[PDB]
Design a protein around this nucleic acid. Structure first.
Lengths: 133, 52, 94, 47, 150, 48, 180, 103, 175, 51, 28
RNA sequence: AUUAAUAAAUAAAUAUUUAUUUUUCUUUGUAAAUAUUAUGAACAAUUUAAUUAACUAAAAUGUUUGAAUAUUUAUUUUUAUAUU
């Protein structure tokens, strides 16, 4: 009948704790590193936290779950835009995998410098110590 | 520029699965004929595949 | 027709096809078993989906090694095709 | 196209790297003079 | 145990998720070129790039239009949900090379040439298939004629 | 690895055959094309 | 079918509340629709043959004259089924684009393709875990229909001298119990 | 800096019972005069933080030794460790290690 | 130059006096009206409509003690994806449901936990073959799929996960 | 606020598109790739059932 | 310009996407 | 873009047609043939460095205290959420 999934596998984190136990709560404050300003999360930030890419119709169940289904359980067809969205997700995965492979190959070849940053950043930012030797 | 549209090609192996199925079946028949040692059967099956 | 999560069983069938392509024939057979059970319960007798899933199950049996089971399943598939009306040319060729 | 692209990349790098130049009185860039690092009155703590 | 990790050591890199937060076209063309190198052209676009000196240079150049998040290789592997023994190098070798925009070609005319060659080789696949079938049939007929002569 | 270009060992079992060998490269299973399960399209395009 | 829960008391107390007409807030075509057992809606085009018995998967809310179940974001065990009455195009919208400078005029006709769907049935079969406290996030082990899970008290204390005082009845009128 | 040898020997024997030596030397010199129980790092890695996870968690309860041929290099490594939060750092040389018997 | 002469002369009957009587005046007025309506639709109509919806939701929240600001933030926090149009519709036609939503937002009920990341089962790391059978990871995935199949709805396939998993043995024929 | 401080891993969620989408057999030590190469490769809608 | 497709792109409608009705064996 | 006038690689801009798969993490509009080409700034300063939009909805932008009041020096009160 109806469907409600937050993960591809359909698994979800325990939402309801044991009876009488103090429940866990999210971090209402924004993820800003500095203690100040002490700002509460925006609605868009909450959407990001809960999984939607800032908008209701970008990512998450509202985008991944079929909007209809035949009464006898037969699923819906693959729309062109649905295939395009699946290709986009595969493209994000491919980008991540290729970036990781590039980093690994650079590490194996020995190109990853032991110094933290590039020459420009090093001569611009005092926070990077001096690595002369 | 954008002349790939003037040569857009769609493979029959992809846009007609029956053709691919029969092509594979004829390839297997030709292999079986070669294994058995038959010649006329292999010739006729390969020729029919070519005609298809 | 009785309700059956055909979306989930289609997920299982796609996973079984992926296992077939990857050479995990036992896993493909296990998935096709559930898919065939669901299709048999859902669709009426001598249905295109049922005969197709039986074809896939026969292929899985043959690849695993149960040649007799595969032969029996494909024979039943041919019987169902004969019983049906206006069978799919692609399906009968496969 | 390769030469033009390389020249464009070099121009962008040259115009975007050296954000600021040391004062000429302290050290004349055109005369090849350069200023070393003076860490005398520095600190080690991550401030 | 208040001591150094007693075992073989493996180096682990990082991956940057770069998100464009300001209209890239409102800046100078150098900033836009660096953003395009990072594969960013519009606000709200996010890309995943390796942690290498060139990418770091680009992000440093465009740090006022880009928000950066870091993900070690371990974190990225956990995020995608793959066994730890599998390697991103293996995944890259397995995934196809013609996925999307194969490569940034010198010009859109060369891109059209690349697409044309893709289609030409697609057609040549079937053409050579048929030609090989014809050649094998011809060889079989020649062998049959030789046997008949003998 | 299944999609690798080179050959694959088969000493484990002679009777075990690869899907590509059994059905060929140009033929793929009739995947269930549905919103929930979307398969790859046009393997000819996929090649290169 | 009906509501279920490991607690027999809560199950038997909540099952009677589900009986009756129901409404459902569903998500479809990037639009949200509130529908009932006999409501007709116009959703964006669905590639569905006319006269087809269709079902809506992702449902944001269900409710009735005596209960309300919310989804965060979605719900489960909700059977919203409809019939695809029509596949047509709604009223045309004319966009006329022109600029005083250049002598170019563009006339775009947008007849918004739509599918008209009449909801035929709505059913709910929830699985409740247990009573949930509101003013505290903990969920109770024991369900007591005869006692308010979160009692409420009046506001007036006398300390706030310049407080807008309403009529006494409204200011302190006690509430009944909706489970007896 | 340089310290007596018997004290270092007894401390390393009956105090740590593990690995607490970080070797910052060129690969050629390390191969020429190797130490099996000392972990080989680079002073740049120490200062940058690439060695943070391998280094012991208990800062106060962990006392480290640095093996280097250059006093300046050893001091830089000690400064990096102190910056990362390891103040209990001492410097040793291959001659002292050999005389102690740690090699 | 193209103008919507034939298309607009048709509706020229909707004007008054000189515009409705004389072709040129009516066509000019209709062209201007169409262009202005297009501009309004593409740059102000959505703003006006969504402001009206915002005000309706805010008035409902005020009647219930809350307001649009806190209501929106708490809806985001609780992960209740109700668009403002849906909130207005619920408030106008289902006041009890809207009050229930407001009560949910007010209550200290823990909001739903964030979505989980895919977890690699220990069966993936389990060696296979150890030194006719199925990979344990594949078996676990099949069990999860069958569980999802059964839990999606009251299907007649039966609730016996083991029986469903052993389905292929039904079609298998003993030699 | 239009200055939101949230991780970009949240900005791009990978929850409903895990690696199994393209490497379905990855969890079973089988690296088979089935990835939808491009939107260009779309043969069109296909009916799931004859009914 | 040049497109990177770094963001979601809707596939363009093309005649190759026509729903082809599968060949069916005659009823006689 | 802009060099009148003896042995100096190359005017550019716009338009039309057309051409080249060279390797490097990513990215990148280069070339030829042809047609046309006064929409026009005076000083100072510094410098080998500074009017465009397919429809529906969504959508994050935005009156006192180095004095005052007072008397012959003492008094006084010095974060959020949300909206294109």
């Amino acid at each position: 009948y109806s469907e409600a999934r937050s993960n591809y596998d359909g698994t979800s984190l325990p939402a309801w704790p044991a009876p009488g136990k103090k429940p866990t709560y999210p971090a209402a404050l924004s993820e800003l590193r500095l203690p100040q300003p002490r700002m509460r999360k925006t609605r868009t930030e909450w959407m990001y936290y809960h999984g939607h890419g800032g908008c209701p119709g970008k990512y998450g169940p509202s985008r991944e779950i079929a909007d209809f289904e035949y009464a006898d359980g037969t699923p819906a067809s693959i729309s062109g835009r649905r295939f395009a969205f699946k290709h986009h997700q595969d493209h994000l995965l491919v980008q991540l995998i290729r970036a990781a492979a590039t980093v690994e190959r650079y590490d194996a070849s020995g190109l990853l410098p032991r110094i933290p940053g590039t020459a420009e950043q090093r001569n611009w930012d005092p926070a990077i110590p001096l690595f002369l030797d | 520029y954008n002349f790939e549209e003037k040569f857009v090609y769609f493979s029959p192996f992809d846009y007609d699965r029956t053709f691919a199925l029969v092509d594979q079946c004829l390839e297997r028949a030709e292999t079986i004929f070669n294994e058995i040692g038959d010649v006329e059967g292999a010739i006729r099956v390969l020729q029919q595949r070519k005609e298809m | 027709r009785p309700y059956v999560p055909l979306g989930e069983v289609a997920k299982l069938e796609l996973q079984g096809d992926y296992y077939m392509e990857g050479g995990m024939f036992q896993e493909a057979l296990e998935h096709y078993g559930v898919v065939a059970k669901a299709y048999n319960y859902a669709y009426p007798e001598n249905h295109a989906q049922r005969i197709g899933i039986r074809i896939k199950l026969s292929a899985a049996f043959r690849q695993t090694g149960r040649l007799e089971s595969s032969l029996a399943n494909i024979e039943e598939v041919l019987r169902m095709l004969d019983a049906s009306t206006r069978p799919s040319l692609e399906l009968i060729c496969e | 196209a390769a030469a033009a692209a390389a020249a464009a990349a070099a121009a962008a790098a040259a115009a975007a790297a050296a954000a600021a130049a040391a004062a000429a009185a302290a050290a004349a860039a055109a005369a090849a003079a350069a200023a070393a690092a003076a860490a005398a009155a520095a600190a080690a703590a991550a401030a | 145990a208040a001591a150094i990790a007693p075992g073989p050591y493996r180096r682990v890199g990082n991956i940057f998720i770069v998100h464009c937060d300001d209209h890239p076209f409102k800046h100078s063309w150098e900033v836009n070129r660096m953003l395009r190198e990072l594969r960013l052209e519009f606000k709200g676009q996010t890309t995943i790039v390796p942690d290498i000196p060139q990418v770091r240079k680009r992000i440093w150049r465009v740090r006022h239009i880009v928000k950066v998040d870091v993900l070690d290789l371990d974190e990225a592997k956990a995020l995608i949900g793959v066994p730890e023994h599998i390697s991103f190098t293996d995944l890259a070798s397995q995934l196809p090379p013609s996925f999307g925009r194969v490569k940034a070609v010198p010009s859109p005319v060369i891109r059209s040439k690349m697409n044309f060659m893709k289609l030409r080789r697609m057609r040549l696949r079937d053409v050579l298939h048929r030609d090989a079938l014809e050649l094998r049939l011809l060889e079989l007929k020649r062998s049959a004629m030789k046997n008949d002569e003998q | 690895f299944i999609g690798v270009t080179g050959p694959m060992p088969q000493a484990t079992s002679v009777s075990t055959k690869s899907y590509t060998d059994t059905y060929g490269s140009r033929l793929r299973p009739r995947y269930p094309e549905s919103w929930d399960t979307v398969p790859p399209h046009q393997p000819s395009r996929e090649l290169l | 079918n009906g509501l279920r829960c490991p607690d027999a008391l809560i199950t038997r107390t909540l099952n009677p509340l589900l009986n009756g007409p129901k409404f459902a807030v569903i998500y479809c075509g990037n639009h949200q629709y509130k529908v009932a057992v006999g409501d007709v809606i116009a959703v964006q085009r669905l590639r569905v043959e006319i006269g087809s018995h269709i079902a809506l998967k992702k449902v944001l809310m269900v409710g009735g004259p005596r209960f309300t179940a919310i989804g965060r974001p979605l719900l489960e065990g909700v059977r919203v089924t409809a019939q695809v009455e029509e596949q047509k195009r709604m009223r045309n919208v004319v966009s006329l684009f022109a600029t005083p400078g250049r002598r170019h005029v563009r006339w775009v006709d947008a007849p918004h393709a739509a599918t008209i769907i009449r909801i035929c049935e709505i059913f709910y079969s929830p699985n409740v875990v247990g009573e949930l406290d509101k003013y505290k996030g903990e969920l109770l082990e024991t369900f007591t229909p005869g006692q308010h899970t979160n009692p409420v008290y009046p506001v007036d204390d006398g300390y706030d001298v310049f407080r807008k005082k309403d009529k006494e009845a409204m200011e302190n009128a006690t509430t009944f119990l909706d489970l007896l | 800096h340089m310290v007596h040898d018997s004290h270092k020997l007894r401390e390393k024997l009956s105090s740590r019972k593990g690995i607490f030596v970080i070797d910052v030397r060129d690969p050629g010199e390390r191969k020429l005069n190797p130490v099996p129980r000392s972990v080989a790092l680079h002073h740049h890695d120490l200062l940058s933080g690439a060695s943070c996870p391998i280094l012991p968690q208990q800062k106060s309860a962990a006392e480290l030794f640095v093996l280097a041929s250059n006093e300046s290099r050893g001091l830089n490594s000690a400064a990096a460790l102190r910056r990362w939060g390891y103040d209990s750092v001492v410097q040793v040389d291959y001659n002292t290690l050999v005389e102690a018997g740690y090699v | 130059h193209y103008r919507a002469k034939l298309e607009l002369d048709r509706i020229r009957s909707m004007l008054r006096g000189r515009a409705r009587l004389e072709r040129k005046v009516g066509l000019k007025r209709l062209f201007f009206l169409m262009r202005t309506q297009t501009r309004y639709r593409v740059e102000q109509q959505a703003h006006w409509e969504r402001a009206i919806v915002r005000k309706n939701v805010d008035s409902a929240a005020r009647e219930h003690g809350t307001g649009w600001q806190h209501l929106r933030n708490e809806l985001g926090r609780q992960n209740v994806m109700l668009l403002p149009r849906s909130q207005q519709l619920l408030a106008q036609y289902e006041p009890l449901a809207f009050r229930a939503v407001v009560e949910l937002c007010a209550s200290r009920i823990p909001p739903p936990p964030p979505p989980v990341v895919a977890s690699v089962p220990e069966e993936s790391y389990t060696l296979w073959p150890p030194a006719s059978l199925s990979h344990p990871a594949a078996r676990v995935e099949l069990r999860c799929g069958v569980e999802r199949v059964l839990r999606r709805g009251p299907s007649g396939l039966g609730n016996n996960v083991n029986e469903l998993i052993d389905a292929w043995k039904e079609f298998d024929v003993s030699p | 606020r239009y200055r939101l401080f949230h991780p970009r891993r949240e900005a791009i969620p990978m929850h409903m598109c895990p690696a199994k989408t393209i490497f379905p057999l990855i969890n079973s030590n089988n690296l088979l790739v089935k990835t939808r190469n491009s939107w260009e490769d779309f043969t069109g809608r296909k009916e799931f059932d004859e009914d | 310009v040049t497109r990177l497709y770094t963001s979601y792109y809707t596939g363009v409608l093309y005649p190759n996407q026509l729903v082809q009705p599968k060949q069916r064996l005659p009823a006689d």
